[PDB]
Every structure is written in C-alpha cells, then in structure tokens.
Amino acid sequence: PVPSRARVYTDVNTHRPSEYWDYESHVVEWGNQDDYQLVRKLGRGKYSEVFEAINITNNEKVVVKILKPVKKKKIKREIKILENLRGGPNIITLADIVKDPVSRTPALVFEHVNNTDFKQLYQTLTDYDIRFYMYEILKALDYCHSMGIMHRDVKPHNVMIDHEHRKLRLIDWGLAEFYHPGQEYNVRVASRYFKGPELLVDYQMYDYSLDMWSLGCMLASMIFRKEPFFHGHDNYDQLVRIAKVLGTEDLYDYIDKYNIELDPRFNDILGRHSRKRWERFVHSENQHLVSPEALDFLDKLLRYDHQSRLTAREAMEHPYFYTV
Ligand SMILES: Cc1ccccc1-c1ccc(CN)cc1Cl
Ligand SMILES: Cc1ccccc1-c1ccc(CN)cc1Cl
DSSP: OOOOOOSSSTTTTTTSOHHHHOGGGOOOOOOOGGGEEEEEEEEEOSSEEEEEEEETTTTEEEEEEEEOOSOHHHHHHHHHHHHHHTTOTTBOOEEEEEEETTTTEEEEEEEOOOOOOHHHHHHHOOHHHHHHHHHHHHHHHHHHHHTTEEOOOOSGGGEEEEGGGTEEEEOOOTTOEEOOTTOOOOSOOSOGGGOOHHHHTTOOOOOTHHHHHHHHHHHHHHHHTOSSSSOOSSHHHHHHHHHHHHOSHHHHHHHHHTTOOOOGGGTTTOOOOOOOOGGGGOOTTTGGGOOHHHHHHHHHHSOSSTTTSOOHHHHHTSGGGTTO
8 A cells, every 4th residue: 555644743753752652661650549439320431431430539520430451551552642631622631540459440530521412412502503612622633633642533422512611522532542654553443433434445554634534424413413424334334335425436546546455345335426415415404504614614524535634723724613
C-alpha cells in the first residue's frame, strides 16, 4: 500500500520527548481505594464496569470505572493518554487511579457527569443545539489531535452530555493511540457503525482523520434522525452500507490511490452503487434540523479519502458554526 500521513499535527509526537508518548515506560501510582465508596452501578462497558461513587474525603460524587485487566499495556496506554489530556477542553478528567487490594483489580476514577439520555437528546435537540454540541466535540478533537492523540472510538455512547448545564465530555480513551507519521496501526478499532473506510479496507496508515469520519457518522444520524446512519451487520457489510450512499466509483478510486488490496470476502457483496444526494435523506420528521450549511459540512466529513476530510480545525471554521 501507498504511504500516507496526517495533513495536521503531523510531527507533534516526533518533536516531543519519549516520556510523553512512551506509555509502556509510564509509572502508574495508585491512590487510596478507601477514599471512595461505591454508590450504584451506572453502565457496563465491554472492558469495564462503571459505578457512581462518593469521595468520602471531600463529599464529591465521582465515577469509578472498574477494569477487568485482560491486557496490562492497554491500561497503561489509557492512563498515559488521560494524564496527557487532563484539563483539555471537554476531555473527561481522570481524578485518580485505584486498586482493589484483595482481587488486584485496577479502577479509574473520573469526574462525575450527569448524562442526558441519548434517546432524550435525540427527541429534544434543536438545530442550534446540534451545532453547539458538534462544536464542543470539535474543541475536544482539535485538542487531542493537537496533543498527537487519535481517539479511535468516537460515537454517541462516548460523548457525555449534561444538557441542563450545556456541558459535554468526550470519554472512553481505552482505544486511543499516539499518532506517529508512517506508523501502521491495528484496524480493529472504533465501533462498527463509526469505522472509517480506511479500517474496513484494512489500510493501516491512518490518522486523526479517522475521528472526523466517526464525527460525520454522528452528525448524519442526528440531523437525519437515522440511528445509526450506516447500519452494517458485520465489518464487511459496513463498507457496503457506506458504498450505498457514497457510491462504488469513489471507493475504487480511493483503493487505487493507496494501492489497497480488497479482501476476497467483498467480491460477492460489494456490487455497484451510484453516489447519492444528501438532500434525499430529508423528510418531514428531520427537515427542521437540516440546512444547506449542515449538508455542505456533512459532505466535507463523509469522504472515503481520509486526506480529503476536513480536519477538526477546518471544521470549526465551517459556516455551519457561524451561529455558535
Ligand atoms: C472494588 C474495587 C475494584 C477495583 C479497584 C478498587 C475497588 C475498591 C475497593 C474498595 C473500596 C473501598 N470502599 C473502593 C473501591 Cl473503588
Ligand atoms: C450524535 C450527536 C450529534 C450531534 C449532536 C449531539 C449528538 C449526541 C447525541 C447523543 C449522545 C449520547 N450521549 C451524544 C451526542 Cl454527542
């Protein structure tokens, strides 16, 4: 395959000391698990169990993410990234790291966010609200990309919103990675509906632009009231669902540009599809959230060619946000 590199923040990690990005050498230091009393179960993650807790030293509510330690290196990576990004705009704050003495189980302690229901948000958000929150996510992405980090798991479940306080936090940094130009990354990242075409065609030299694809998927779902927007039933079918909207000609152009070899499993499912018009998704139930600026913005995120997508900084300058 033809090599590629990010159009922005390309060399941020190259020009930083090894300590910043070498998470395997990061020294983790435990806090006191006895400072925290678990209150109730919140949600159960693929790699974790989440609880609401009280920090008994200051009477503050926190969230405790108990991690089943399947892989030690992965935990160190999440911790290092959270420490690096701590205090960034709209980045979840890691408050502490604790261990359960008897079971030797690690847990991450975060600032508590009173999360508005996804279904509730879908029903009541206004056109202005969608622009406001999309801009808040962009602040988080432009910051983490500027810090040489790709989130790689951008999706609604990883975006906590306290609608009452208009507060947004990008969470679950468990799949996040440091961007090093020329590096070949594992394509088995992100959640199916949000996986960029680069991951689906097994193009390993991807970058921050993967997060911009995921963000486009979110925007498309909310403005069109179609969740998820690209409803794949498996990783191969996910590429067909995208191909049904963006057409198959630009898919081959993208494959040819980077000399990508398509897996044989695509041969009998991919087919031939025309490029569709974003206006075809407009209906009576979603027209109050769609505008020419929204469609132009979406068209600039949802592109096969990862290099052609708006960067988070370019996205922040789009007319869709002139009202925020
Ligand atoms: C249950 C657990 C799992 C992983 C890390 C820490 C803990 C833990 C153990 C004891 C206490 C004290 N009430 C608190 C926690 Cl979070
Ligand atoms: C998908 C989307 C797009 C634009 C604005 C808000 C949202 C949104 C909806 C629900 C949730 C669930 N915690 C998160 C977000 Cl960012």
